Amino acid sequence: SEISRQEFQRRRQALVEQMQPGSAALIFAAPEVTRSADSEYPYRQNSDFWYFTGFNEPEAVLVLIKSDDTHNHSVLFNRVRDLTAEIWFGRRLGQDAAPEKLGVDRALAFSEINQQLYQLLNGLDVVYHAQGEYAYADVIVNSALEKLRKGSRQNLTAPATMIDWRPVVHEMRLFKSPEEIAVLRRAGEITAMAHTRAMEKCRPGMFEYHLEGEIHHEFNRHGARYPSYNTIVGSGENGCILHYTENECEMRDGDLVLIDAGCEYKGYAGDITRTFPVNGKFTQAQREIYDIVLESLETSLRLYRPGTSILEVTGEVVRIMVSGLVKLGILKGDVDELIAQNAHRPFFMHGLSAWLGLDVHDVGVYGQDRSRILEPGMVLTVEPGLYIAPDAEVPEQYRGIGIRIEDDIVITETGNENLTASVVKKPEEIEALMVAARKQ
């Protein structure tokens, strides 16, 4: 499953449908990024630019021109064919092949953008530009507008209105096509296989980074070369650090390990967290915390559907957490009073759900306190956790326990579809999986 030229074209058209007549939208590629000295990081295209192109080169700009309500066309600026640069650094699409390959009407050399962009904007009423997204892009846009403003003697005129297209595009991205959902389903499966593998490989004495290695190898073998974010492998007290990515410690017999990892597959992210015993067996204390987090996730998965909200479901989770913590003596008092005091916050300090798509923590408006009403096509994580610090004023057996369990779901007409349920999370199933692996 991937995204086709025809879909990128439909997206461009859907944006054009929302634009004023006499306007142009400018969408810029990500710059290349230095790792050290003359070496660059592996290229990651800007998500919005990707969304409208599927084109994985820097020094590229998509220009959508809406002349009026019937006439529109597209111009791509992109790197020219150059034998020498290509022998050295790789093949370039170039101008001749781009229109057919990408489905754009015209292609021009990026090297000519300053000579050409102002000509495309001349006489328009509106320019759609994500101001402040990239410095290099702002420079190009501001220079073109300045030429037009200052060019009255050459009969040039600048569009006086600049609109940030990010709100409109981010609303588009918030609602996935069936094809996007198919890609996300595969990302979920790949990510799940990686997590299963980490559970099956984990042994006391291995380093946290060894599990990262197993995960990244599994991503790669299914064609997801890169993770969607830096893999977290937090064992023991490291599990209480939310974005722990050092992954430098030896994993101890008797500790839990929390793994938060996701692949990037054809542009789309998986995002799974599983927490499990390093030695294959939850202690009683570990199991007691684990059960609360799992009940939180399982209830959330029953509830998520069109017409509810992240906020509403979060309320249910908070009650489950407070109730469970009171039962274990971690919190003390009346459950309703404790809920009213947000007494769970020292142990569950983050949100339950984030949008998912081309990015983790994907784009799109949440509403105040994530109160936006859910509709079919929205894709989100469900990630309850409890983190009991090593020095927390709680019964000693719970100190240093960090547990999160996270699935990715898509809202459907009738509820939700869980994209990541093919990696186990019930404690007895985790133990059985690890017992079986440990016998080999």
Residue 131 binding partner per list its own copies, Mn ion, Cl ion, none, with a CB distance cut-off of 5 to 8 Å that depends on partner kind: its own copies
- Any long-range contacts for 140-144 (C-beta under 8 Å, 24+ apart)? 140/28, 140/61, 140/113, 140/114, 141/26, 141/117, 143/114, 143/118, 144/114, 144/117, 144/118
> What is the nearest approach in angstroms of Mn ion to the Cβ of residue 13?
34
Contact 408, 180 (CB under 8 A): no
Residues 81-110 that bind Cl ion (CB under 5 A): 109-110
**Residue 360 within binding range of its own copies, rule CB under 8 A:** yes
Contacts of 63 (CB under 8 A, 6+ apart): 24, 25, 26, 27, 74, 75, 76, 77, 117, 120
Contact 7, 13 (CB under 8 A): no
> 1, 10, 3: which is closest to 182 by C-alpha?
1
Contacts of 378 (CB under 8 A, 6+ apart): 174, 175, 176, 355, 364, 410, 411
**Residue 136 within binding range of its own copies, rule CB under 8 A:** no
Nearer to its own copies, 105 or 146 (CB): 146
Give me the 313-352 binding string for its own copies, x by CB under 8 A, dash otherwise.
------------------------------------x---
Residue 271 binding partner per list Cl ion, Mn ion, its own copies, none, with a CB distance cut-off of 5 to 8 Å that depends on partner kind: Mn ion
Q: What angle do CA 279, 283, 287 make, to 5 degrees?
A: 115
**Residue 161 within binding range of Cl ion, rule CB under 5 A:** no
Residues in the chain, overall count: 440
Nearer to Mn ion, 214 or 271 (CB): 271
Residues 110-129 that bind Cl ion (CB under 5 A): 110-111
Binding residues for Mn ion, rule: CB under 5 A, are 260, 271
Stretch that binds its own copies, among 60-68, 176-184, 223-231, 319-327 (CB under 8 A): 223-231
Residues 87-116 that bind its own copies (CB under 8 A): 87-91
**Which residues lie across from 109 on neighbouring strands?**
78
**What values do phi and psi take at 128, rounded to 5?**
-100, 120
Contact 191, 262 (CB under 8 A): yes
**Residue 244 within binding range of its own copies, rule CB under 8 A:** yes
> What is the nearest approach in angstroms of its own copies to the Cβ of residue 337?
25
Whose tokens are 């846009």? That residue is 141
Nearer to its own copies, 271 or 288 (CB): 271
Residues in contact with its own copies by CB under 8 A are 30, 33-42, 44, 46-47, 86-91, 131-132, 142, 145-146, 149, 152, 155, 158, 160-164, 166-167, 207, 209-210, 212-214, 216-217, 220-221, 223, 225, 228-230, 240-247, 349, 358-361, 363, 365-366, 368, 387, 389
